[PDB]
Amino acid sequence: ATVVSGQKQDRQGGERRRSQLDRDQCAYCKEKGHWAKDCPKKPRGPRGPRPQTSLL
RNA sequence: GGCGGUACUAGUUGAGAAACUAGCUCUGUAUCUGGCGGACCCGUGGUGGAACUGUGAAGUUCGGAACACCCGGCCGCAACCCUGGGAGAGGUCCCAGGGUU
Ligand SMILES: [Zn+2]
């Protein structure tokens, strides 16, 4: 056949870290003990307090 | 907890407002990159072979494999982006594909 495909191009370099994330660390608060999916910061309803006004 | 703006409160300085510091109020804030489940398909991917020999390590024989738990991809999902097309009084739209999580 000859002539089908070819290039052979070098391209490397993928060194990146996640704040030295640990298998026992949190990727949210950076706290060690729980996981991000278990971060106590994870907000969620219902809502806390409730506003209310009258004549103003 | 920390800081900034606000006012006030205290202390100091000062004649002076004002300056500074501290206290604090409110106000506001700032982070899920390792993705999570699902099924159970593929790779012996990872790790602990089993007994036996032996003071000890190490081996040996067995099987030459098995199992188990995890593992990756993989699928379902949402997020982000690359890519394109065409018209539109200037970058609007709509929609599909992939990768990664
Ligand atoms: Zn956390």
For chain A, report the end-to-end CA distance as a whole number of angstroms. 86
Protein-contacted bases of chain B (C-beta within 7 A):
31-36
Residues 14-53 of A with CB under 7 A from strand B: 18-19, 21-30, 35-37, 39, 41-42
Mind spelling out the 3-state secondary structure of A1-56?
CCCCCCCCCCCCCCCCCCCCCCCCECCCCCCECCCHHHCCCCCCCCCCCCCCCCCC
> Among all strands, which nt has the closest C1' to A39 (CA)?
B32
Q: Which CATH class name applies to A1-56?
A: few secondary structures
Residues A31 and A29: their CA atoms lie apart, in Å, by 5
CB-based contacts of A26: which residues, under 8 Å, 6+ apart? A32, A33, A34, A35, A36, A38, A39
Domain ranges of chain A: 1-56
